[PDB]
Swiss-Prot record, chain D:
Family: Belongs to the RNA polymerase beta chain family.
Parent-record interval covered: 1009 to 1069 of 1070
Known role: DNA-dependent RNA polymerase catalyzes the transcription of DNA into RNA using the four ribonucleoside triphosphates as substrates.
Organism of origin: Nicotiana tabacum
Subunit annotation: In plastids the minimal PEP RNA polymerase catalytic core is composed of four subunits: alpha, beta, beta', and beta''. When a (nuclear-encoded) sigma factor is associated with the core the holoenzyme is formed, which can initiate transcription.
Name assigned to this protein: DNA-directed RNA polymerase subunit beta
Location in the cell: Plastid, Chloroplast
Top-level lineage group: Eukaryota
UniProtKB/Swiss-Prot annotation, chain H:
Coiled-coil region(s): none
Designated gene of the protein: rpoC2
Function per UniProt: DNA-dependent RNA polymerase catalyzes the transcription of DNA into RNA using the four ribonucleoside triphosphates as substrates.
Family: Belongs to the RNA polymerase beta' chain family. RpoC2 subfamily.
Naturally occurring in which organism (per UniProt): Nicotiana tabacum (Common tobacco)
Subcellular location: Plastid, Chloroplast
Protein's name according to its UniProt entry: DNA-directed RNA polymerase subunit beta''
Assembly with partners or alone: In plastids the minimal PEP RNA polymerase catalytic core is composed of four subunits: alpha, beta, beta', and beta''. When a (nuclear-encoded) sigma factor is associated with the core the holoenzyme is formed, which can initiate transcription.
Binding site for Zn(2+): 43, 50, 53
Length: 45, 97, 127, 61, 421, 204, 41, 133
DNA sequence: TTGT
DNA sequence: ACAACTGCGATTAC
RNA sequence: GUAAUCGCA
């Protein structure tokens, strides 16, 4: 269960999302989520 | 079941993130992580003292973690050690970028 | 990575930038699955910022402003269409939500799908 | 890894054989140097660990 | 197809597992099978003796109903908003004696509270007919109990429930309270569910460590046994209740997972709270006023009982199969039988024979006191295949007590026989 | 305040954001018959009844109506203080309820079933009032127009009601682009007005 | 840490006894620091 | 927390409980009165502290486990970050119209002449199509 | 030097 | 009288 | 093994 965002994502929004993911799923899932996000970000850049 | 999640799970298993998941699962059942570290160290020391020649390419700490995971109902390879079936031949090593 | 994410989730030209004349005198693509939209983007059928409609399976997790429907179409038979800013919610006389279509771009659905698939792949690899 | 001559000598043997490396109990050469220096300065320094079991003082040299 | 205790029953609905699953409840290695008595938990995998416990159930805290034991009533599954008069009803209760009332009120409000797991879970809960508690019992059942003390206590508990319902749920009460229990039968059923499915465990959430009474879903579907295979452990980091198999025990496919309620209580408390009785209860007490005293050491020797008086078990290793007469019944007998131990003095056969004959006479007297026999009770039981669960529980309690007395007589006879070898 | 607690089993309970509306229901097979003679408004989840503001002539006879809801979804971000604490909270937040009388009080299962878009009753939670909507019939035919081809367009936060033919409708993309273009034009003119050359200029 | 000779002379004349309940004390002595894994519980 | 917080008969949070963002939001919503919390100040020792006096660990989000050295951590967490007249303008081109009798003449600090204002005044920028105040 |  | 960033690497001069 | 001097980040 994750929200769907239709607005611009910035550094503060990313930090908030990472904190909420650490709170909900824990650091273990957040590590893989962050790796996938980094891969997608590099690809799109 | 997502249709296009084969390669992701394959890479998660091959890379070694299973070890991190198992460490988190075993730390979710312990009050103080320092005592858990000391217990794992003592168990690995006992394993090494029991069979010296057994280890050297297989890690006793990974063996302890795999035994603890297998005793909990989760199947894990012995000491999290896997071999590449697609290796070309002897003396050929993969280059991990 | 921040630049890539910002380009993904930035949005699209909405007002005078997308159209030269007022549409009063007178978006198009409809995708049932996110996989179809991502495949169409890979095949260069639709651009990164090109708007589209995506059908959702009764979740209503899209964050948006507390804004009433801009226009509501009610037919004789009982089915009323509620047009919102970023989504369309068709319902019937029985107050039953028949269909929900989200209006977004490939970037937002790509980010959502990659996060969801990371979580699901972690959960599957655990077993 | 730094200063303990005996332990360091034993580390290579234990690694080549494969046995577990015991925890060093003796003071490093840096501490021993200090003691020697301070005692050249006419100042003493003794470890003097006390056993909780039998209440005995044991000097570590 | 090997015959197993799970095979005789039928599998449960897929939905029962599913509602928990979408809410993070997880089950590993177990299957839920429904039957005439009710839902039960069975194994679906062969488990060899393990060094440490294995978690079969992980039950989150957000699906549970928990009330603290002490005076500050803290609802960690906080479904009751502030200012609601249901808290005024809950707080207007004695802290020590009456705890089922607050759990019943909380369960009723959870049934009323929207988007709650208990709203869906109540459908699988046993109905008024399926419930075996003696609160939902007629006077005929209490009379058939043939025990005046237990019948009086159950009647007093029913009276307390009715009085509490009549006091708190008056006409002037707001509609939000009235819709909870419009009829007193609903409140009695809520109290029955609270009493028959309550767990008393110590839980730690955040920095606070407290003891509380909790209603945990999917953990009340495990039956009772005096040799348990699992226990209710608590995990504070994930804030989940976990059921773990006992370490060093071998579980085979088809076995029934069981947990122990009230370890060390007589059948009276079981029949009072859960409406259940067991013939092999090792803690049953039979009041014998005879001056005679049997020898405890020779009794435990001839019946191969080893351990301290606080922990008795049959050493089947010395038993070498054969004797299966030994069970919890003889343990409860040795516990309740009058015994004498004077250093290392050896027992006298004539005195012990007089003692066992006096005990057999007293046991025959006590058995004649009940206006029924084991065969009559068994015939009445088999004669009624479908009937009230309370009457069946009553006749089963009678039959279990009669069988316990008969087995005490038989054990005394076997002792008298084997002492002379 | 009426000071007597009514039996809500014989009433239609309509929930709003800040109010609850009760309308008496005559015995009927399908719960679509409304009696507007007796009606009450209550605070959210409160048993203290009151009399609503009748701001329009209400029907004094039994009529068959269809209920609808108008509002906006409030998707918030609740603070996470637990491991499995929810990531989001979604609320419907109904604001206005529309009651559309069935044509000739016909049942839904009848072979000929149509909604009478000329008799609309709205309920507002903010004002605690029920009134009759003002529609603007623009479909040719006057009062003899067939009801099988009608479309009720509701705009301006439930304040504009228009009856137009079904074929003469705009797709959601069209109205979304229209509103976006209008807002963008207004904002762009507001931004460019401050420039010292806005007077001698041309919007192209 | 700042005035080594002064505090050394003062402790020498007094005869102070230090119980190694601190981190740098075990660091200088070259032993297990009573922090984390070094804290016996 | 070191003392229970009561809003009427109900207790929002008891003693020895770890405050969280939800608890703070509930407190600011219910307008709680001064709250008693634990702190390294109220500890009973100066050589060491306890888990409850310190509180939640900054690393993971639970009570500090026994053996953790919070002293060093605080020093590093303090040292590492140690490295780091409104002017009204005309909205459009136009004439200015205002009543000069209400304003008092004065001399600005820039040597220019100006009108001092001490009471709410309305000035109108008269443009081709609109008026601004 | 700069300040302690 | 006392102290004023952390380390690394290169050279030449004793 | 110590100094001097420069560079590095």
């Amino acid at each position: 269960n994750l929200v769907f965002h239709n607005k611009a994502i910035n550094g503060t929004a990313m930090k908030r999302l990472i904190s909420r993911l650490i709170d909900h799923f824990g650091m273990a899932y957040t590590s893989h989520i962050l790796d996938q996000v980094k891969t997608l970000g590099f690809q799109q850049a | 079941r997502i249709p296009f999640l084969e390669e992701q799970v394959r890479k998660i298993r091959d890379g070694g993130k299973l070890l991190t998941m198992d460490i988190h699962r075993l730390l979710l059942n312990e009050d103080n992580r320092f005592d858990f570290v000391n217990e794992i160290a003592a168990e690995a020391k006992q394993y090494v003292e029991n069979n010296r020649d057994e280890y050297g390419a297989k890690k006793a700490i990974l063996h302890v973690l795999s035994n603890r995971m297998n005793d909990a109902g989760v199947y894990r390879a012995e000491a999290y050690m896997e071999s590449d079936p697609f290796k070309p031949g002897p003396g050929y090593m993969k280059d991990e970028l | 990575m921040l630049i890539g994410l910002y380009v993904l989730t930035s949005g699209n030209h909405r007002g005078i930038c997308v159209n030269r004349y007022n549409p009063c005198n007178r978006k198009e693509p409809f995708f049932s699955n996110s996989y179809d939209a991502i495949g169409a983007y890979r095949q260069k059928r639709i651009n990164l910022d090109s708007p589209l409609w995506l059908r959702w399976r009764l979740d209503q997790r899209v964050i948006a402003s507390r804004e009433t429907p801009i226009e509501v179409h009610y037919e004789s038979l009982g089915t009323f269409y509620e047009i919102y800013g970023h989504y369309l919610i068709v319902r019937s006389l029985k107050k039953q939500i028949l269909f929900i279509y989200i209006r977004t771009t490939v970037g937002h659905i790509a980010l959502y799908r990659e996060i969801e698939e990371a979580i699901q792949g972690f959960s599957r690899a655990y077993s | 890894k730094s200063d303990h001559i005996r332990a360091r000598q034993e580390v290579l043997g234990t690694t080549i054989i494969g046995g577990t490396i015991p925890n060093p109990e003796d003071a490093p050469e840096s501490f021993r140097l200090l003691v020697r220096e301070l005692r050249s300065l006419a100042l003493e320094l003794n470890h003097f660990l006390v056993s909780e079991k039998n209440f005995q003082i044991n000097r570590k040299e | 197809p090997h015959d197993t205790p799970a095979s005789q029953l039928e599998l449960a609905d897929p939905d029962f597992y599913k509602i928990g699953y979408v809410r993070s409840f997880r089950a590993y290695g177990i299957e839920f099978r429904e039957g005439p008595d009710g839902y039960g938990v069975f194994a679906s995998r062969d488990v060899e003796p393990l060094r440490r416990a294995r978690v079969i159930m992980e039950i989150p805290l957000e699906l549970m109903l928990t009330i603290s034991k002490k005076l500050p009533w803290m609802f960690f599954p906080d479904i009751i908003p502030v200012g609601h008069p249901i808290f005024d009803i809950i707080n207007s209760t004695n802290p020590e004696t009456d705890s089922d009332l607050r759990l019943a009120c909380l369960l009723l409000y959870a049934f009323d509270c929207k988007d709650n797991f208990w709203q869906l879970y109540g459908d699988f809960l046993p109905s008024d007919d399926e419930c075996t508690s003696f609160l939902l019992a007629t006077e005929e059942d209490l009379l058939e109990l043939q025990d005046e003390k237990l019948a009086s206590t159950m009647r007093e508990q029913q009276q307390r429930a009715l009085e509490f319902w009549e006091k708190n749920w008056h006409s002037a009460v707001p509609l939000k309270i009235k819709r909870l229990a419009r009829d007193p039968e609903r409140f009695i059923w809520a109290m029955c569910i609270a009493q028959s499915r309550s767990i008393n465990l110590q839980m730690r959430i955040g920095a606070l460590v407290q003891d509380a009474n909790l209603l945990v879903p999917y953990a009340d579907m495990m039956n009772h046994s005096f040799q348990p295979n699992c226990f209710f452990h608590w995990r504070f980091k994930d804030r989940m209740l976990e059921v773990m198999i006992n370490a060093g025990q071998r579980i085979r496919k088809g076995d029934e997972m069981t947990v122990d309620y009230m370890a060390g209580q007589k059948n009276n408390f079981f029949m009072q709270r859960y409406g259940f009785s067991s013939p092999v209860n090792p803690w049953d007490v039979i009041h014998f006023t005879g001056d005679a005293k049997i020898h405890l050491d020779t009794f435990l020797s001839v019946f191969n009982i080893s351990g301290l008086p606080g922990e008795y078990y049959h050493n089947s290793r010395l038993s070498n199969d054969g004797d299966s007469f030994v069970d919890g019944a003889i343990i409860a007998a040795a516990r309740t039988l009058p015994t004498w131990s004077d250093g290392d003095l050896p027992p006298i056969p004539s005195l012990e024979r007089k003692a066992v004959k006096e005990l057999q006479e007293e046991c025959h007297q006590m058995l004649a006191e009940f206006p029924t026999t084991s065969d009559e009770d068994q015939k009445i039981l088999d004669s009624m295949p479908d009937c009230r669960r309370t009457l069946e529980a009553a006749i089963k309690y009678r039959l279990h007590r009669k069988l316990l007395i008969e087995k005490v007589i038989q054990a005394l006879d076997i002792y008298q026989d084997r002492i002379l070898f | 305040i009426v000071d007597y607690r009514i039996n809500e089993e014989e009433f239609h309970k309509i929930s709003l954001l800040d109010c609850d509306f009760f309308i008496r229901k005559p015995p009927d097979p399908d719960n679509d018959v409304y009696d507007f003679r007796e009606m009450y408004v209550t605070p959210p989840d409160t048993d203290i009844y009151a009399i609503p503001r009748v701001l329009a002539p209400m029907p004094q006879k039994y009529i068959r109506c269809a209920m609808s809801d108008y509002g906006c979804y409030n998707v918030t971000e609740p603070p996470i203080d637990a491991p499995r604490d929810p990531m989001y909270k979604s609320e419907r937040e109904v604001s206005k309820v529309f009651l559309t009388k069935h044509y000739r009080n016909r049942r839904a299962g009848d072979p000929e079933f149509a909604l009478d878009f000329e008799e609309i009753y709205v309920i507002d939670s903010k004002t605690k009032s029920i009134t009759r909507a003002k529609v603007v019939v623009t479909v040719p035919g006057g009062r003899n127009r067939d009801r099988k081809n009608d479309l009720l367009v509701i705009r301006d936060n439930g304040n504009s009601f228009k009856i137009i033919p079904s074929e003469e409708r705009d797709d959601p993309t069209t109205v979304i682009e229209k509103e976006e273009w209008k807002k963008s034009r207004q904002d762009m003119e507001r931004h460019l007005r401050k420039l010292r050359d806005f007077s001698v200029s041309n919007w192209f | 840490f700042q005035e080594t000779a002064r505090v050394l002379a003062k402790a020498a004349l007094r005869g102070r006894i230090d119980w190694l309940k601190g981190l740098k004390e075990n660091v200088v002595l070259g032993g297990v620091i009573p922090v984390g894994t070094g804290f016996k519980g | 927390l070191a003392d229970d917080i009561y809003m009427g008969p109900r207790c929002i949070a008891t003693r020895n409980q770890d405050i969280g963002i939800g608890l703070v939001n509930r407190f600011i919503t219910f307008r709680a009165q001064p709250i008693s919390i634990r702190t390294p100040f109220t500890c009973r020792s100066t050589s060491w502290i306890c888990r409850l006096c310190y509180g939640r660990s900054p690393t993971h989000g639970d009570l500090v486990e026994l053996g953790e050295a919070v002293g060093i951590i605080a020093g590093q967490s303090i040292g590492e970050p140690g490295t780091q007249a409104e002017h009204v303008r005309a909205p459009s081109n136009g004439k200015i119209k205002f009543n000069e009798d209400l304003v008092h003449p004065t001399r600005t600090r820039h040597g220019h002449p100006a009108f001092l204002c001490s009471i709410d005044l309305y000035v109108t920028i008269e443009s081709e199509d609109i008026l601004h105040n």
